[PDB]
Amino acid sequence: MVETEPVQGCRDFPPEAMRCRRHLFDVFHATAKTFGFEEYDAPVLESEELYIRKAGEEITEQMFNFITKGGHRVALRPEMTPSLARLLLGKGRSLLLPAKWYSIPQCWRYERRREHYQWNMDIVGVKSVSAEVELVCAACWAMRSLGLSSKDVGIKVNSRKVLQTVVEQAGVTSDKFAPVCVIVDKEEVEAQLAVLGPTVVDAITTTLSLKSIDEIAQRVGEEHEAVKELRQFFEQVEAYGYGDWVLFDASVVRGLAYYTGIVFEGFDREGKFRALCGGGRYDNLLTTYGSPTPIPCAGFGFGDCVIVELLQEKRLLPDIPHVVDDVVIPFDESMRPHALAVLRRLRDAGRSADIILDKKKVVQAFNYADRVGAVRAVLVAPEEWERGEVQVKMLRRGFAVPLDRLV
Amino acid sequence: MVETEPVQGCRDFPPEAMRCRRHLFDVFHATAKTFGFEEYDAPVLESEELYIRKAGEEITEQMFNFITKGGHRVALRPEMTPSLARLLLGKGRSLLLPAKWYSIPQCWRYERRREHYQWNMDIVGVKSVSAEVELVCAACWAMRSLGLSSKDVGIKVNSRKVLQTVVEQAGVTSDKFAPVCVIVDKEAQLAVLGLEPTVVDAITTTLSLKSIDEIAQRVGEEHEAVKELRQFFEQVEAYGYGDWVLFDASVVRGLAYYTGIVFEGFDREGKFRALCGGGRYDNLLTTYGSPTPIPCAGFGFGDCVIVELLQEKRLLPDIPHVVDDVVIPFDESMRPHALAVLRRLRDAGRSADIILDKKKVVQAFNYADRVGAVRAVLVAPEEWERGEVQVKMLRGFAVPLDRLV
Ligand SMILES: N[C@@H](Cc1c[nH]c[nH+]1)C(=O)O
Ligand SMILES: N[C@@H](Cc1c[nH]c[nH+]1)C(=O)O
Numbered sequence: 001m002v003e004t005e006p007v008q009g010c011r012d013f014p015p016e017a018m019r020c021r022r023h024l025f026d027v028f029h030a031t032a033k034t035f036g037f038e039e040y041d042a043p044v045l046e047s048e049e050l051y052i053r054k055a056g057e058e059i060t061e062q063m064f065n066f067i068t069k070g071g072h073r074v075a076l077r078p079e080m081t082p083s084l085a086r087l088l089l090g091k092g093r094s095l096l097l098p099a100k101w102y103s104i105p106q107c108w109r110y111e112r113r114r115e116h117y118q119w120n121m122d123i124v125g126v127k128s129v130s131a132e133v134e135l136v137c138a139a140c141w142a143m144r145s146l147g148l149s150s151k152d153v154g155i156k157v158n159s160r161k162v163l164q165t166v167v168e169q170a171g172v173t174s175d176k177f178a179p180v181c182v183i184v185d186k187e188e189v190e191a192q193l194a195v196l197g198p199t200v201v202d203a204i205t206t207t208l209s210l211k212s213i214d215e216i217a218q219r220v221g222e223e224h225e226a227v228k229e230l231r232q233f234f235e236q237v238e239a240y241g242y243g244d245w246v247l248f249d250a251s252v253v254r255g256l257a258y259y260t261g262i263v264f265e266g267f268d269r270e271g272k273f274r275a276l277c278g279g280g281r282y283d284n285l286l287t288t289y290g291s292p293t294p295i296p297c298a299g300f301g302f303g304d305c306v307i308v309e310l311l312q313e314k315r316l317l318p319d320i321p322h323v324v325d326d327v328v329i330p331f332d333e334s335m336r337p338h339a340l341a342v343l344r345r346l347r348d349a350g351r352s353a354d355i356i357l358d359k360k361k362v363v364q365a366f367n368y369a370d371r372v373g374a375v376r377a378v379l380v381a382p383e384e385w386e387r388g389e390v391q392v393k394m395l396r397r398g399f400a401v402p403l404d405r406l407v
Numbered sequence: 408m409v410e411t412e413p414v415q416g417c418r419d420f421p422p423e424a425m426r427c428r429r430h431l432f433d434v435f436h437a438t439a440k441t442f443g444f445e446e447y448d449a450p451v452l453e454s455e456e457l458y459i460r461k462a463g464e465e466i467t468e469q470m471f472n473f474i475t476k477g478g479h480r481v482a483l484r485p486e487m488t489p490s491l492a493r494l495l496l497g498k499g500r501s502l503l504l505p506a507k508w509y510s511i512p513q514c515w516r517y518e519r520r521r522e523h524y525q526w527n528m529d530i531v532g533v534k535s536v537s538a539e540v541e542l543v544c545a546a547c548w549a550m551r552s553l554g555l556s557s558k559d560v561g562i563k564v565n566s567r568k569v570l571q572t573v574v575e576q577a578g579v580t581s582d583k584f585a586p587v588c589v590i591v592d593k594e595a596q597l598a599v600l601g602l603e604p605t606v607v608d609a610i611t612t613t614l615s616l617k618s619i620d621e622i623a624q625r626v627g628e629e630h631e632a633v634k635e636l637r638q639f640f641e642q643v644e645a646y647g648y649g650d651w652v653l654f655d656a657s658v659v660r661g662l663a664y665y666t667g668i669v670f671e672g673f674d675r676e677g678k679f680r681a682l683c684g685g686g687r688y689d690n691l692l693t694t695y696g697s698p699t700p701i702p703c704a705g706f707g708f709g710d711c712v713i714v715e716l717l718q719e720k721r722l723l724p725d726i727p728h729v730v731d732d733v734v735i736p737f738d739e740s741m742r743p744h745a746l747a748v749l750r751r752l753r754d755a756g757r758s759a760d761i762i763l764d765k766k767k768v769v770q771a772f773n774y775a776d777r778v779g780a781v782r783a784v785l786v787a788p789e790e791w792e793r794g795e796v797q798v799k800m801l802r803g804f805a806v807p808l809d810r811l812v
C-alpha cells in the first residue's frame with residue numbers, strides 16, 4: 001500500500017470535512033463582500049528575503065523554507081502580509097487609494113499543524129482609526145454570521161504607541177522597539193529585555209498592567225495620540241452597534257515586528273482557546289520595502305482552526321449533509337436515452353441533478369437518492385413516457401408529471 | 408527595494424486579475440453543483456513516492472520536488488489524481504459508491520509557467536461509459552457557461568483498448584502498454600521499449616483510422632472499445648451535446664494510468680493546446696494496493712488555455728468591482744450617524760462602504776464612482792434631524808432611514 005495518511009502536519013479535506021471548511025469560507029467571502037473588500041491572491045511560494053525582518057519573531061523562526069534545484073532561497077509563506085506589500089509596492093502610483101483587499105491563503109510553518117488557512121483583510125491608504133474600526137467590525141460580523149454572540153467572544157484592543165512613548169522616554173533607540181514588542185508579546189521576558197539592552201522593564205510592565213484608558217491618560221496625558229485614537233475607535237464601534245464586542249486591554253501587543261499603532265485580537269470569553277484572530281496598523285512596512293512615499297496600512301488575520309474548535313464547543317457546526325435537487329432514475333437501460341433528455345432539462349433550468357449511472361433496480365436507485373440527500377426522485381418509465389410524463393416522488397407517495405412542468 | 412516580481416513562473420492575482428479567475432472558478436463550481444459532484448481538497452505537498460510510476464511520463468519528468476529538513480522526499484503535486492486515489496484508498500470500505508468528487512487545486516511543475524490551477528472532476532465506482540458521458544458533458548457545460556459554442560470547441564474521444572489489442576496481438580508484455588501510450592502520445596522510442604518495425608506499422612495504421620466503423624473492420628464490432636464508444640456517443644447525443652463530441656483514433660493522452668476511454672477538449676481553429684483532458688483509469692487503485700479493483704474516470708481542465716481562448720473570442724470583458732452603497736458623512740461630526748446607517752444597510756444584505764478618511768463630498772462621490780457604487784448615501788445634519796438621508800442613484804433626494812433597505 002501507498003501511505004494513505006497525508007504529509008506530516010497537513011490536513012486532508014474529504015467531502016465531509018470540505019463542507020465545514022466551505023461553510024467557514026462562505027462567511028469570510030460574504031463578510032468581505034458586505035464590507036466592500038476585493039479579492040486577491042499571490043503565490044504560496046515566495047522569496048525567503050521577503051521575511052527577513054531580524055526582530056526574533058516566532059513567525060520567522062518557524063519558516064518552512066527550502067532551496068530550489070537552482071539555488072534560490074524560497075519559502076512557503078508563513079503569512080500573507082508581505083505578499084500584499086509586494087503587490088502594493090509593485091503597483092506603486094497606479095493603485096487607487098483607499099484600497100480594501102482580502103484573501104484566504106493557506107500559510108505554512110515548520111517547527112503539530114504545519115499548515116492553516118488564514119482569512120486576511122487589509123485596508124490601504126487610510127490614516128485614521130476608521131480603518132481599524134471597520135476591520136474589527138468585519139471580524140465581529142464574521143463571528144456573528146457563524147452564530148456566535150458578544151457573550152461568546154470579544155476583541156481586545158490596544159495601541160503600541162503607549163509602549164513606544166514609555167520605551168522612548170528611557171532613551172531606547174527606535175530600532176529596538178520591534179524586538180521589545182516581540183518580547184513583551186511573550187519570568188523569561190524579564191531576562192530577554194536586558195539582552196536587547198531594570199527600571200525600564202519596571203515601567204513597561206506597570207503600563208501593560210493598567211486596566212483602563214483613563215489610567216493610560218493619567219500616565220501619558222489625555223491628548224496623547226494613543227488616547228485620542230482609542231477613544232475615537234471605541235466611539236465608532238459603539239456607533240456601528242458592536243460596543244459589547246470590544247474592550248480595552250493594555251497587555252495586547254501581538255507578535256509581529258511591523259505594527260505601529262492600534263493592535264487587536266479576538267478571544268473566547270471562557271478563556272479556553274488561543275486567539276481567534278489578530279491584527280493592527282502597520283504604517284511603516286511599505287517604507288521598509290522601499291516605497292518612496294509612506295503608505296498607511298492596517299489589517300488582520302483570522303485562522304481556520306481555532307474558530308472551528310470554538311464553533312464545535314458551542315454546538316454551531318452541525319454536519320450539513322450533501323444535497324442535490326433531483327435524482328433521475330431510468331426504469332431500465334432502454335430508458336437511459338430518455339432519462340438523459342430529462343436530466344438535461346433539469347440542469348438547464350438551474351437545478352442540481354444526478355442520473356443513476358450504473359445498472360440497478362428502482363428501489364436501490366431510490367435508496368441512493370436518499371443517501372445523497374435528494375429532494376426529489378424522477379423515475380423515467382416507458383408507460384409514463386408515452387403519455388409525455390415522468391413519475392415524481394418527493395423525499396423531503398408518487399405521481400405523474402408532464403415533462404414541461406418539472407422545472 | 409524588495410523584488411516586486413513574483414517567484415519565477417508564478418502568477419500574482421491583484422483584484423483585476425482575481426475577478427477573471429473568479430469568473431472562471433464560479434463556472435467550475437456551478438457546473439460541479441449542477442452535476443452533483445462534491446468538493447474535496449488535500450495538501451499541495453505530497454510524498455514523492457506518490458508519483459513514481461516509471462513510464463517516462465512528462466508529468467513525472469517535470470516534478471517540483473525537494474527534500475525536507477529531516478530527509479523526506481516530498482513534492483508540490485504535479486496533478487491531483489494520485490491525491491484523490493490516496494484519499495479513496497484511505498476511506499476503503501467506508502466510502503459509499505458511487506462517489507463524484509471535484510476540486511480546483513493549484514498544481515506545480517519544474518522544467519515557462521511553473522504553476523496552474525486545474526479543475527478536477529472524477530467519478531468513482533461506475534463501471535459503465537455513463538461515467539465518461541457525464542464527465543465529457545460536464546466539461547462541455549462549463550465551456551458553454553463561459554459563452555463558447557460547439558462551433559468554437561469540441562471534445563475528441565477515443566479508447567486505449569483498441570491500441571491495447573493491437574499491441575497485445577504482437578506478443579508485447581502487458582507491463583509495456585503504459586510506456587507505449589506515453590510514447591504514442593508524442594518511431595525510435597518504441598524500438599527501445601522493445602517493439603519491432605511491423606508492430607509500429609500496425610500502431611500507426613490504426614491511430615490513422617478516421618471512424619468507428621473503420622475500427623470495427625479491424626478489431627470486430629463486438630470488441631469492447633467499439634461497443635463502449637457507440638454507447639458513449641449515443642448517450643451524449645441523447646443528452647443533447649452531440650455537436651460537441653467526435654471520434655479521434657489518435658487521442659491517447661500522456662498519462663500512464665488510463666485503461667479505457669480517453670478524451671480531450673480543443674479549439675476548432677487549431678490555435679491552442681488542449682483545453683482539458685481525461686479518461687477512465689480502472690487499475691490505478693489496484694496499483695496503490697486496493698484489495699478490490701475500483702473503477703474510476705475523470706478529467707483535468709486547466710485555468711490558462713481556456714482564458715487564452717476566451718480572450719481571443721472576446722468573452723472576457725473586464726467586469727469592474729461593484730458595491731451597492733457608499734455611505735458619505737457630510738463631515739466628521741456625522742460619522743457616528745453614518746456608521747448607524749452603514750450597519751443597517753449591511754444587516755439588510757447589502758454591500759456597502761463608508762468613506763473612511765476625511766474628505767469633501769464631491770471627492771467622496773468620485774470615489775463612489777471609481778468603486779462602482781450603485782447608490783450614494785449622503786448623511787447630512789439637516790436631513791438627519793428630519794429622520795432622513797440623501798440618496799443619489801449612480802448607475803438627489805431625501806429618504807427616510809427606515810425605507811433605505
Ligand atoms: N499577518 C498578521 C495578520 C495581519 C494581516 N494584516 C495585518 N496583519 C498575522 O499573521 O498575524
Ligand atoms: N490527472 C489528469 C486529469 C485527470 C483527472 N482525473 C483523471 N484524469 C491530468 O492531469 O491530465
Ligand SMILES: NCc1ccc(Br)cc1
Pocket residue numbers: 107108109113114115116303
Ligand atoms: N496564528 C496561529 C497559527 C499560525 C500558523 C499556523 Br500553520 C497555524 C496556526
Ligand SMILES: NCc1ccc(Br)cc1
Pocket residue numbers: 514515516520521522523709
Ligand atoms: N496541462 C498543461 C499544464 C500542466 C502544468 C502546468 Br504548471 C501548466 C499547464
